[PDB]
Design a protein around this ligand. Structure first.
Ligand SMILES: *[C@@H]1O[C@H](CO)[C@@H](O[C@@H]2O[C@H](CO)[C@@H](O[C@@H]3O[C@H](CO[C@H]4O[C@H](CO)[C@@H](O)[C@H](O)[C@@H]4O[C@@H]4O[C@H](CO)[C@@H](O)[C@H](O)[C@H]4NC(C)=O)[C@@H](O)[C@H](O)[C@@H]3O)[C@H](O)[C@H]2NC(C)=O)[C@H](O[C@@H]2O[C@@H](C)[C@@H](O)[C@@H](O)[C@@H]2O)[C@H]1NC(C)=O
Ligand SMILES: *[C@@H]1O[C@H](CO)[C@@H](O[C@@H]2O[C@H](CO)[C@@H](O[C@@H]3O[C@H](CO)[C@@H](O)[C@H](O)[C@@H]3O)[C@H](O)[C@H]2NC(C)=O)[C@H](O)[C@H]1NC(C)=O
Ligand SMILES: OC[C@H]1O[C@@H](O)[C@H](O)[C@@H](O)[C@@H]1O
Length: 602
């Protein structure tokens, strides 16, 4: 007879109810299971009724794989899932945190910290629209973005994934969600999930909650703050995500006053679901439940019990799915976990899939392939790269002539630094590889290339990664652009207590600037010790992690546009002042939050 859930003309809730009612325990626990493609098989997906797959950082089909290759990989897994008794489509997730960053040829936008410096929410929303298009270009339908953590300590390896230390700014930047998922109807009830159609993707507000407030900025650590502060600083943006219909929420590895978020029923169920009335689905982080215990995994049984009872709906195992499914099954069969907990979880997961139209469009659209790296997206990224730059100095003394903007026509100029012609360094973490990489890892324009593409034909451009003072003094240069900074890094690898850039960096700038007026471009994912650099430079710009479009940097350096960016964070004098954010008692910053010198287009 008529199968309600397969009828695309019926209300979502009706379809969810109808489907849930036909599911066996194995099929329900299956929807709650997300596995890495690396361990996925047509059989595994089919026999285990897997409800979701994902690519962790760097998990790709081949290096340099095309958009069709991705589409073919996803469709391949989907066909397996579509062959199950019920034919429930799987949802594929990936970290498109600044463009479809794992994919070769994808547009790499500036990381979040730089986007906050723009103070332009509409721009960010536009990036979310381009990102969605480029993710769908590879056949993926779910992006683990945006990270709305409010980084309160630069020493945190993930501080560049935070728009700012000021919740008010992070709240405003949640416009990425409507960009990725599409605008919600005027009626829309806050808390409901939403995705416009096959050209949009499900989003994910992460990492619930307070992930940006751990002590000393130690990643995945403990966040010590009273409930007033947790709600005043780290919770706000989530309420905005609710109003904008974010489809999912990822739980943080971090703890709040000693309690693991992956096991906090009060926050996940009591607050996020019951209070904010989130109706989408809550997903864990990579082995998130494993790390509830210490050692991690030392008691997987407890991990599953605690996380599921806490309220989580879908688990990112992401490898040992047999162990996960087996253990959860046992608990349900034994009454440790009620069917209502399972049904609730499966209800939310199915609601999201039906709402985004997954049952109507389970497969990739080949016509979307060309969205990947579309020039207009790169132009957008270029605009964002430019708008994110923060000019911290433009002249050694009050009477000096402003070095910037630089003339496009000069007899001979010098471009130097470890970051002047290194695309990988320019993009930072989460680019091609998980921890990011060095060199020409994808399609883009480095600072050097951008310079060569901007100057007048008569302008000779010389490149020298690390020239000694002599080479510069006798080079006959009119001026120099030196680029130095941090190396790509992600998560814990990023935790840093000294926050000083790797060498050669300062030495190159001191060598170059000592020989000719220089404009230093600082590539970093957060504020770093900068007094020495300032001392040697005539002009210094904080470019953060610009992305693949280096011309955005030269668009400001040469005057095609004036600098407009303002600090999204506080720039400290020394690391032992930290923590130290705006509104603090001992606020003694080198540069207040909101600081930024400006220039006018020539
Ligand atoms: C302030 O604290 C931080 C700690 O977070 C510290 O940085 C870390 O230092 C670790 C050593 O104690 C280092 O671990 C070793 O890394 C080796 C490989 O390192 C290279 O490759 C990784 C992988 O991409 C990069 O992240 C590194 O930056 C490094 O990259 C090379 O660096 C050189 C020198 O700058 C450069 O010329 C190369 O071109 C560049 N190549 C690449 C790959 O881009 C391993 O082989 C070894 O087994 C250890 O694991 C950490 O990687 C590093 N963290 C990061 C992300 O930088 C920092 O230390 C300073 O900086 C490092 C790079 C090194 O030069 C130290 O001597 C220097 O002191 C510390 N600063 C202070 C004030 O001490
Ligand atoms: C926040 O981070 C600190 C680390 O900076 C965590 O404390 C550290 O916890 C580990 C184990 O969890 C301790 O490691 C040692 O491991 C060996 C290996 O078996 C064991 O035999 C030792 O007895 C010891 O456990 C480490 O000593 C400890 N270090 C500190 C600074 O106390 C802390 O648990 C983290 N908190 C959260 C909420 O994540
Ligand atoms: O790879 C997927 C996930 O990996 C985890 O390690 C990170 O904490 C998440 O932000 C990310 O979405």
């Amino acid at each position: 007879d008529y199968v309600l859930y397969k009828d695309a003309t019926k209300p979502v809730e009706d379809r969810v109810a109808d489907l849930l009612g036909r599911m066996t325990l194995a099929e329900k626990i299956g929807q709650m299971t997300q596995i890495e493609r690396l361990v996925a098989t047509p059989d595994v997906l089919r026999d285990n009724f897997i409800g979701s797959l994902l690519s962790g950082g760097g998990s790709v089909p081949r290096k340099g794989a095309t958009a069709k290759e991705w589409q073919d990989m996803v469709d391949g897994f989907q066909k397996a899932c579509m062959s199950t008794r019920l034919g429930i489509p799987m949802i594929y997730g990936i970290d498109a945190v600044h463009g479809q960053n794992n994919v070769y040829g994808a547009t790499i936008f500036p990381h979040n910290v730089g986007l906050g410096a723009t103070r332009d929410p509409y721009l960010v929303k536009r990036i979310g629209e381009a990102t969605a298009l480029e993710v769908r270009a590879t056949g993926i339908q779910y992006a683990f973005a945006p990270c709305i953590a409010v980084c309160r300590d630069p020493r945190w390896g993930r501080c560049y994934e935070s728009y700012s230390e000021d919740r008010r700014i992070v709240q405003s930047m949640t416009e990425l969600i409507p960009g990725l998922q599409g605008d919600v109807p005027k009626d829309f009830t806050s808390g409901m999930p939403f995705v416009a159609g096959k050209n949009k993707v499900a989003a994910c507000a992460k990492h619930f909650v307070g992930d940006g407030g751990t002590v000393d900025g130690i990643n995945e650590n403990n966040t010590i703050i009273n409930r007033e502060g947790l709600m005043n600083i780290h919770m706000p943006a989530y309420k905005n995500a609710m109003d904008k219909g974010v489809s999912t929420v990822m739980i943080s590895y971090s703890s709040w006053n000693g309690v693991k978020m992956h096991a906090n029923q009060d926050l996940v169920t009591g607050y996020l679901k019951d209070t904010l009335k989130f109706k989408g689905f809550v997903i864990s982080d990579w082995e998130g439940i494993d790390r509830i215990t210490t050692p991690a995994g030392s008691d997987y049984s407890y991990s599953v019990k605690a996380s599921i009872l806490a309220g989580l709906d879908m688990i990112m195992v992401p490898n040992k799915y047999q162990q996960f499914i087996s253990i959860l099954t046992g608990h349900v069969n034994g009454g440790v976990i009620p069917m209502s907990r399972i049904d609730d979880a499966v209800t939310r997961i199915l609601r999201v899939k039906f709402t985004m139209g997954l049952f109507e469009n389970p497969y990739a659209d080949p016509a979307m392939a060309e969205q990947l790296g579309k020039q207009e997206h790169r132009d957008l990224a270029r605009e964002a790269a430019r708008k994110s730059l923060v000019l911290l100095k433009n002249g050694k003394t009050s009477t000096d002539a402003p070095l910037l903007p630089l003339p496009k026509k000069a007899p001979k100029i010098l471009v130097a630094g470890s970051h002047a012609d290194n695309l990988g360094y320019q993009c930072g973490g989460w680019t091609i590889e998980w921890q990011g990489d060095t060199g020409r890892t994808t399609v883009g324009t480095t600072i050097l290339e951008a310079v060569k593409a901007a100057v007048d034909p008569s302008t000779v451009v010389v490149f020298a990664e690390n020239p000694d003072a002599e080479f510069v003094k006798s080079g006959g240069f009119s001026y120099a652009i030196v680029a130095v900074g941090e190396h790509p890094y992600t998560e814990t690898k990023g935790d840093n207590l000294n926050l000083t850039i790797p060498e050669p960096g300062l030495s190159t700038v001191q060598a170059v600037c000592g020989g000719v007026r220089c404009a230093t471009v600082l590539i970093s994912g957060r504020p770093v010790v900068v007094q020495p650099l300032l001392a040697a430079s005539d002009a210094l710009v904080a470019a953060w992690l610009p992305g693949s479009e280096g011309q955005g940097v030269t668009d400001a350096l040469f005057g095609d546009f004036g600098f407009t960016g303002r600090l999204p964070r506080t720039w400290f004098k020394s690391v032992d002042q930290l923590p130290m954010n705006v509104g603090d008692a001992h606020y003694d910053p080198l540069f207040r939050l909101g600081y930024g010198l400006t220039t006018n287009a020539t």
